[PDB]
């Protein structure tokens, strides 16, 4: 429907069934990117030159796909899980949270 943008997505470790090995947190806000990359690509869609050129090419011939709405900025989060040893470990997972979206 609309343009590329960030959408809310909460991952509850129980719904997916990971609460058996992940002790904390019980869930977290991951978010996700989605939406069209039209012409022209506006400032806030923070896109690369290639995405620009690809979008124009698609305008000349639709056999070539449009740019894609994907994460452009991501933050990490910390989790407490149980390794095979049955011991609680603290790990810091990178790129777990979508901070911003864009057309690539």
């Amino acid at each position: 429907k609309s343009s590329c943008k960030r959408h809310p997505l909460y991952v509850d470790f129980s719904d997916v069934g990971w609460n058996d090995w992940i002790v904390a947190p019980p869930g977290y806000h991951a978010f996700y990117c989605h939406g069209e990359c039209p012409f022209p690509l506006a400032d806030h869609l923070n896109s690369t030159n290639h995405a620009i050129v690809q979008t124009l090419v698609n305008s000349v011939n639709s056999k070539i796909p449009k740019a894609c709405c994907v994460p452009t900025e991501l933050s990490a989060i910390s989790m407490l899980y149980l390794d095979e040893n049955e011991k609680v470990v603290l790990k810091n997972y990178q790129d777990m949270v979508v901070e911003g979206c864009g057309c690539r």
Partner: protein, 83 residues
Amino acid sequence: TLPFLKCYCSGHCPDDAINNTCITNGHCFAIIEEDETTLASGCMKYEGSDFQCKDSPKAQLRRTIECCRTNLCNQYLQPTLPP
């Protein structure tokens, strides 16, 4: 390369826009398309702007885009479809 231009946006406004305006370090643009005909405007980042403001004469759908670098130069712009 810090945003300094204030533009009027319509159809291409970022989610945090205020009173239909966006800020940018590139250009303000207005565009008309077809297939029916609509008018939109917004902010265009500087990098890659020469590609977008030129557009391609061989696009499948007829449309005209215009760029300018003056605060709210967007506001009143009526590009005209190509003959």
